[PDB]
Curated annotation (Swiss-Prot), chains A, B, C:
UniProt-recorded name of the protein: Bifunctional protein GlmU
Lineage of origin: Bacteria, Bacillati, Bacillota, Bacilli, Lactobacillales
Chain segments carrying region Linker: 223-243
MF GO annotations: glucosamine-1-phosphate N-acetyltransferase activity; magnesium ion binding; UDP-N-acetylglucosamine diphosphorylase activity
Residue ranges, annotated region (Pyrophosphorylase): 1-222
Amino acid sequence: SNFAIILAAGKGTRMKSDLPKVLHKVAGISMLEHVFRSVGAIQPEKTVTVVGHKAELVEEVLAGQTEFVTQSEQLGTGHAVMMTEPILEGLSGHTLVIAGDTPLITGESLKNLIDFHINHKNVATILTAETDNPFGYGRIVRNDNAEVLRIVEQKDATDFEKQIKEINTGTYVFDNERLFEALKNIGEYYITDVIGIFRETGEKVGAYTLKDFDESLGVNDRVALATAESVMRRRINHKHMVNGVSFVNPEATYIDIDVEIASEVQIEANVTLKGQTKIGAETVLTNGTYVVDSTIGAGAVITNSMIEESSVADGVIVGPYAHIRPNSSLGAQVHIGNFVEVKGSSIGENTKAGHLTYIGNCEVGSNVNFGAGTITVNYDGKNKYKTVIGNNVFVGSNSTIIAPVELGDNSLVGAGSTITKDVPADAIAIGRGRQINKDEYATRL
Amino acid sequence: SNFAIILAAGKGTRMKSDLPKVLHKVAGISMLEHVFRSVGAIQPEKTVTVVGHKAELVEEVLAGQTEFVTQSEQLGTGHAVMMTEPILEGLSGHTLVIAGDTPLITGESLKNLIDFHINHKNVATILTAETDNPFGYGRIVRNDNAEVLRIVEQKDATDFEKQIKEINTGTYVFDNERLFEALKNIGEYYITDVIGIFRETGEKVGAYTLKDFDESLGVNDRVALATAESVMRRRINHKHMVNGVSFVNPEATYIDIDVEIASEVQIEANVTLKGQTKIGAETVLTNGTYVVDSTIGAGAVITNSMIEESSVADGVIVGPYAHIRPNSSLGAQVHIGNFVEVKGSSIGENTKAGHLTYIGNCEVGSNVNFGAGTITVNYDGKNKYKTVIGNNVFVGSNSTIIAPVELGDNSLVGAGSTITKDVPADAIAIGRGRQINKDEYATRL
Amino acid sequence: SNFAIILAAGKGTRMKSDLPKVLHKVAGISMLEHVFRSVGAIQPEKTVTVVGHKAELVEEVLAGQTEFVTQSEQLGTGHAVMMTEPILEGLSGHTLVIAGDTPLITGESLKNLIDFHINHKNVATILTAETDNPFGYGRIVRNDNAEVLRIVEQKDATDFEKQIKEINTGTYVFDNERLFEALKNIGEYYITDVIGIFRETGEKVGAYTLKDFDESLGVNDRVALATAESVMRRRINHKHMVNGVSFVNPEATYIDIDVEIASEVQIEANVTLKGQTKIGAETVLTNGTYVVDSTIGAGAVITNSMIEESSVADGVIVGPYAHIRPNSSLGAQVHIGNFVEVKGSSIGENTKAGHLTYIGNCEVGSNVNFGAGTITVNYDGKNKYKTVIGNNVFVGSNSTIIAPVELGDNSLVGAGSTITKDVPADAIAIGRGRQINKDEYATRL
C-alpha cells in the first residue's frame, strides 16, 4: 500500500507574486500539476494535498483528483504533514512526502523511491542527490558502512560536513504509522526532525540517490522557474523528436505539455503551440507560428500565423501574417494569405482569401474567392449580425459586405462594391462609381 | 591515388520517415550532400556511391557528380562495399569508406585520414574518436606499443574492454586491392570483419583519432538530426562572424549552407535565410525576417518581413510585416511598409508603398506613390491580367486598379477610386461618391 | 585617491569595420560605455580616456563625463598611457589602466582590484585570471612564496612556462607617480614592460585573480562580440527575473541594458525591448513583440507587435501584427488589432481599431470605433494634413478619411464612404454607391 502527501502551502516571496508559488506555470500547467502527475506513477491508494495561501485557487486546480487539508499559519513542513493525520494515521503502507515546487521530478523516480523503501525495509527513505556545489542544502551524513545517520544543514554543519556532496532533495517516503506518531514528539516543526526521532530508536533509514541532480530543482524564484521551463521544454521536444517530429531548434521551440503532434511533422524554430493543440501528420509549421487550443489536420502549411480556438482541416495553407481567431473552421485545402483575419466563421473547402481581408461571423461555402481588401461588417456599435456566403461565390476586391446578407451560389460581387442586400444565386452585384479622366489636370498637383 | 565509396542504403527506421535517411536536410542540403562535399577534399580519382532504398530520389541529388551502384536487400556494409567491386577492384590507391549519415565530418579531417594512411603505410586505417560514454560503439583494442589489434563491439566486449573510450566512427580508408580480395573471404557482412582478415595475416592497421568527437555524429533519429542542425548552424554563423557579420544571437539565427553575406551586415536573432540567398554589404536584417532564394543589395533594411524568389536593390526599406512574393524586383531606395504584399511585379526606384497594399502582376515605374489601402486586381476566376504604372504616378488611398490598365506618367488616381480604364499621362482619374451630411441622425443609432 | 585611464585607440581589423572597435554595441550601448560604467564603481577622482581612430565619434559618446587625450599613431599601450601624463603625473593615488574592449568586467571587480592594490601596498597590481586553454595570453610567473615575478608572453615562453594557467587580462592598477616615471625608461611601448622596471628595483607587484574567467573577455572580432552579447544578455535577464519578471526563455529574449521592467511582467521568448523602454507591472509581452524607446503601462497585453517612440497607457491590448509608429499615444484600455498601423497620432481611452486600418496624423477622442479597412489620408505628394476625430465617433468599415477634416462627437461615417468635408457632431455621413442586382448574369462569367 502506497500513500502520498503533496506540500503546497508556501507563499514564495522571492517570486514577488501574489499567486501561490506552486501555481506558477511551466510548459502549460502549474508546477503543482507536474508534481501530481509524477505521484500517480506509484498509484497512491490515498492522496492528500496540503494547502494554505489562497487555498481556493489551488483547490480549483486539483479538485476531485486528490484530498485536501488547510494549514492556518506557516508552521513548517512538520505541521503541514500533521494536517494529513486525520486522513492517514491508522493505515499500513508507505507515505511519500513531496513538495509541489519540484516540477522536474519524474514518476519513474518516485516508483524507484518506493521500490527502494520496500526492498530495504526502511522506516524512512530520503530522496537525495549529489552536486559539486552543495551550498545551502542539508547534507546526508553516513558512515563507513554507508548507513544513513542524519541530515545536517548549514547551521550545525562542521567543516568536515560542509564538504559532503550528497544533499537532501526535500522529498521522502516514510512508514505511515511511525511517521504520525513521531510527529507528536517534536520556532517551526521540520519534516527533517522526524529522522532524528528514528535515530534515537536506531530505526532503519535509507537514501535513494537521484541520477540527474537537475531533476531535483526546487523553484523559489523566477530564475529557477525559467530553468524548469528549460528542462521541461527539452523533455517534451525530445519525446516529439523520438516520435518522428523534426525540429530545426528544439532548444528554441515552445510546445506545451499536452500538445499532440503526429510523425513527419516539420517544425521550424520559434514555433509556439499552447493548450489543447493537435497537429496532424506531415504538417509544416514555420518560425513565428503561434497556435492556442486548436486542431490542425495533415499536410497543412502554417506559415508565420496565429490560430486560436479553431479547427483546421487537411491541406490548409495559411500565411504569412494571418490571424485565425476563436471559433473558426477551415475546410480542406482552404487558402488564407497574408494579413487576413478569420473570426467566428466557418470556411468551406478550397475557399481562397489571400490578401488583406477580414471575415467575421460568416458561414462561407466551398470554392469561394475573396478578392484582396474584402471587408465583412457585422458590428454597428451595439448589435452583431451574420452573413451567409454560398458556394462558388466570387467576392470582388475591396468590397464591403454588410450583414445580415446572403450571397447565393455562383454569385459575383463587383470590385469596390458596398453590399447591403442579399444577392440571389447566379446574379452579379455592382455598386461603385464610374471612371472620369481629366486631361492635363495632374499638372496642377 | 585516392578513391571513395559513399554508403547510403539504410532506410532509417528510427526516423519514422519514408524518405531515405541520408536525404534528410541539415542547414539547407541533405546529409548526403554534406558528406559528398567533405569527400572532394581528398580529390577522389573515382567516387562510387552505394544506394538502395528509393534509389531514384537519391540519384537525382548527386546525379553526374559521382558513380552509383544499387544494393537489392540490406545485407550489411560488407555487401554494400562489394557493390563497388565492378568499378574499383583492380586499381592502386586508398579507398575511403564513409557513410552518408555523418554530415559533420569535415574535408580537412578526411585529408588527415588519407595523409595518416599514407604516412603510416597502413593496409587499413580507422577513423576513431574518444568519448567518456562509449556505450553502443565498437571499441578500438590496441597494445602496449599502441598498435591497433581489433575492433570489438558490445557483443564480444569483456568488462576490461567495456571501458575503452576510443571508439570506431564507422569511417575508414582501406588499401583498394586488398579490400576487395578480403571481402570474398567473409547474418550480414560487416565492413569491420575486414579488419579481422588483416589481423590473421598480420597486415598493418592504424587509427586516426578525430580531435572533436561530436564531429563524428551519426544521425539515426530526429534527435541527432537536430544536433547536426545545431553544430552546422554554429559552424556557418561562425564563418560569417569571421567574415565581418554581426549576430545578436548566432545560436538562434537560421542561415542555410550556401547563403552569401557581405561584411558589416547586421543580423538580429531569429532571422531565417534559405536557399540561394545573397546579402549585400551593411544590410540590416531584424528579428523575424525570412528570406528564400533572393538577392539583397547593400544598405538595405529588412524589418520583420518575408521575401521569396525576388531581387532587392540597394537602399531598399522593407517592413515590418511585409511580404515580397516570387518573381519581384524592388529598385533602389524603394520603400515597402507594413502589411504590403508585392507579387510578380517590378518596382522602379524610389517608389513608395507604405501601407496595407497589394501589388500583383504589375510593372511599376520610379517615384510612384501607393496610398494606403491600394488594391490591384488581376484575377477574375479564370484569367490573369497585367497593369502598367508609369513614373511619378500618385495612386490614391483605398483605390482599386483593375487590370489590364495603364496609368501614364505623372497620373493621379483619386482616393477611393475604382479604375477600369487607362489613365493618360498627366491626367487625373476620380470615380467615387459625394459626401452627404445628415444632422441629428447619429442620435437614432 | 583613485585615478583611471581608459584605453580606446585600437582600430580592430578583425572586426572588418570602419567603426572604432570600442564603439560596437552590446545590449544597447557601446563596449566603451560598459567599461566606463564599471570604472565609476571606484569613484575616480579624475578619469582620462585615451582615443585615436575617429576620435570625433568616440568623444561624442563620453563627452563631458571624462577627460580625453589623442594618440597620433598606434605606438602601443605604453605610448597610450603616456598621453595621460600631462593630466595625471604629479598626483598621489592608484591609477587603473583598463581597455575599452572588455565590456564584461564589472564595477565590483574593479573595486576588488583597488582594494587589493591597497591592502597589499603594491606598486603595480595585475588583474589576472585562470583558464585551461591559455594559448595566446601572457602568463603570470610567480614563485614558491606566490610572489608575482613577471608576465611572459608566447614569444619568450619556455615549455615549463607554456603550461601556466594564470593569464594576464590586460587590466592593471599602478601607483600613479611611479608609473609615469617608469614610462620614460622604455617597435612599440608595452604597458607590460612597466612591470620589468619594477622588478629590477624589486618593487612590490601583486595580482588579483578574477573568479569568472569569462568576465575577462576581450572583443577582437564579431565572434567575441556575440559572446559578450550572450553574457550581457543573460546578466540583464537574470536581474529582471530576480526583480519578479517571468521569462519563458531568458537565453532567447533581447532586452537592452537600460530597459525598465516592473514585477509580475510576463515575457515570452523572442521579445525585443530596445533603448529607453519601460514596462509597467503585470504587462504581458508575446513572442515577436519589438519595442523601441517606448513606455508601456500596467496590465497591457502586447501580442506580436512593433511599438516605436510612443506611449502606451494601462490596459491597452495590441496585436497580433500591429504597428505603433513614432510619436503616438494609446489611452487606457485602447484596443489595436491585427494589421493596424498608428502613426503620429493620439488615441483616447477605450477607442477600438481592430483590423486592417491606418491612422496617421490624427487626434482621436475616447470611445471611438474604427471599422475594419478604415484609411486616413494625410499626404498628397507634397503636404501633410491633420484630422480631428471626436469622442464616440463610429467610423464605417472600408472608409477613407481625407485630411484636413473633423468628425464631431457621436458622428457616424457610413461604411465604404470617402470623407472630404467635416462631419458635424451627432450627424451621419454617407458617400458610396447603391446596390444593383442582375439576375442570371454570373452565368456568363
